Amino acid sequence: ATIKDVAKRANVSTTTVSHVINKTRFVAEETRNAVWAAIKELHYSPSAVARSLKVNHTKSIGLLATSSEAAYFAEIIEAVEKNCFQKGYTLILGNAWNNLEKQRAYLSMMAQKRVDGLLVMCSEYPEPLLAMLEEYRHIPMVVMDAGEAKADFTDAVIDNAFEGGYMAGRYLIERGHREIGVIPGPLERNTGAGRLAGFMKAMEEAMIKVPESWIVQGDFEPESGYRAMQQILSQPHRPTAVFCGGDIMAMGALCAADEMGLRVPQDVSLIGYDNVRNARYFTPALTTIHQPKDSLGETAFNMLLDRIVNKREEPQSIEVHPRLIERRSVADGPFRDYRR
Amino acid sequence: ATIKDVAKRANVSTTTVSHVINKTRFVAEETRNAVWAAIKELHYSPSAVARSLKVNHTKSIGLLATSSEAAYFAEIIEAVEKNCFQKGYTLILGNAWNNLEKQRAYLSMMAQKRVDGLLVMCSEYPEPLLAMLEEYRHIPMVVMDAGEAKADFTDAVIDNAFEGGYMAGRYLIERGHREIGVIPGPLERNTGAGRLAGFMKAMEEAMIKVPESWIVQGDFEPESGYRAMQQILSQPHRPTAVFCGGDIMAMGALCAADEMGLRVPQDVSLIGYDNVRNARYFTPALTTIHQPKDSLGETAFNMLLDRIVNKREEPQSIEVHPRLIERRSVADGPFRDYRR
DNA sequence: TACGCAAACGTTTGCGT
DNA sequence: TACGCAAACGTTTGCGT
Ligand code: HPA
Ligand code: HPA
Structure with a gap:
């Protein structure tokens, strides 16, 4: 139905119908009732399309x-x-x-x-x-x-995101690590370059140099994490800890490690970023920045x-x-x- | 602007504007151009609200x-x-x-x-x-x-979902297991009761009885998985394999196992359901129904x-x-x- | 006091000529 | 041949009395 239909069924003006429907002005009870009564039988559903046309907002x-x-x-x-x-x-x-x-x-x-x-x-x-x-x-x-x-x-x-990168690197430092690697997300993104730089600042502060063989670019997708961890632990000399740009990517990193028989964190410490709802149920339960x-x-x-x-x-x-x-x-x- | 605005700026009728905008009828080039010209300066954006009012569809x-x-x-x-x-x-x-x-x-x-x-x-x-x-x-x-x-x-x-439950139980059977436990999702849901029953049919077929101490209800949330796996491996007598109703729940099951020092699947085989995009990167890579x-x-x-x-x-x-x-x-x- | 009339929002389209 | 007029979709609201 349309407002006209309800108005006719209620024996009232459409203006009136619109007033009870929107409490925009006082309407007699018995009137208000009849309108509702009508509104219900015809099974009326106001049209937001029409309304928005007038009021100018959707x-x-x-x-x-x-x-x-x-x-x-x-x-x-x-x-x-x-x-x-x-x-x-x-x-x-x-x-x-x-x-x-x-x-x-x-x-x-x-x-x-x-x-x-x-x-x-x-x-x-x-x-x-x-x-x-x-x-x-x-x-x-x-x-x-x-x-x-x-x-x-x-x-x-x-x-x-920067003070987030820093926090991560700091923790690593404060835990005894000085041989750290990183899997940042797309440098073209905030959560990418941002986190990375926050992190590198902490490093420079500790005079820790991160060799490029230890920086493998991710894309926030597990596969990328999986692949990067592999390139990292596939080197002669390998880091003792890893900062992984995003949790989901880290979940990939965990897998690869496990597959090369490495142990987390007994063999490699891994720290992520995002604290997605399931991070706690990763194996082992993931440490990350929220x-x-x-x-x-x-x-x-x-x-x-x-x-x-x-x-x-x-x-x-x-x-x-x-x-x-x-x-x-x-x-x-x-x-x-x-x-x- | 409104269509009227563009029409005036193009020196044409609004009908005309609407025709070029919608290719609903032939319009002279020079006309069509001018309209576009107008459409652009005024930076016009047709109103789907108005259109839908007329055409009756959003x-x-x-x-x-x-x-x-x-x-x-x-x-x-x-x-x-x-x-x-x-x-x-x-x-x-x-x-x-x-x-x-x-x-x-x-x-x-x-x-x-x-x-x-x-x-x-x-x-x-x-x-x-x-x-x-x-x-x-x-x-x-x-x-x-x-x-x-x-x-x-x-x-x-x-x-x-039923032939999915069956497939799962069958695999278990065909792999050598006869002591299986299950963590179904809400019985009130299709993917809940459905999967479970498909599974139990396979069981009855093999004359495998699943003791109630081995059926712990999940809710599709990892925590529930985590908690159930715990109740399952916390018993004197414990299953050799487990059918977990949903992957995310299984991810919880993996965690608990790992935490009680159990090994998957060396100590307990786990099979899930959904094949969510990251299931492959669970540890170990999850076997499930897609x-x-x-x-x-x-x-x-x-x-x-x-x-x-x-x-x-x-x-x-x-x-x-x-x-x-x-x-x-x-x-x-x-x-x-x-x-x- | 309680309510109605008619214009109006931005379009599409019928039926012109 | 290429185009325009006016009605119409379903509402809200001004300004009545
Ligand atoms: O771009 C992103 N993608 C996925 N997860 C993320 N977490 C931070 N940034 C991102
Ligand atoms: O209800 C559900 N919730 C979450 N994951 C699921 N997978 C199947 N059913 C469900």
């Missing part, structure tokens, strides 16, 4: 993600969605896989559907990507995963609703903070006792 | 999931979304967590947003849930995870588009098929050599 948010399968991403997504729901919003999920065109498409479809705001999680931000985004400065949006603020027309949440995923979603959604409801103009940035989680994959290194 | 599909974090679910979701995209559709993701009210809410918001169709993945289907769903028989929909066809007004894709996740999404989306575009009336059902993946978590059991 109560829809669009997430332009990289992928949603990856544990990391998946945890954030579910976080963002929880908040949309409690605040009445509907989520439009779009994965662009780091593909420009795909991005151009989703962006477009999004604007056409008139999303009240946009949450961007694209991992890498090449100029061209930045370009398109700007062409959409009119839609309120927050990038949730870049280093600093890439754009000047968007809100940003900073993860402090990315505050939930608050990362809630924070982003909140900066968005702000710009939305309170029509904020100026771009804001909110920092979030990673913290070390000790588990059972790191063991004392050769220099523990000799440490001042 | 080109939106709504996924009413249980949760989207869980590896299993997450893999399916990303599958469904890939298909929506290539076919032009937009995805509205809604997690209801098995909460009736939450379900009632999302359903409602969905109908209001006038989704062209609904994809339901609610895990458990209590009567009340069934009730609400029926009240929405008008929206085309397919349940992707039930046993048989729960409703007569919806399409269904059947996973054959749920065809991708085709499960694509199949569902396709039955949906059917009812949609081809206005199909009668409810269809398409079966999909699980298949055993051998890895390194199962070892020959005491009766291999004695097997006829």
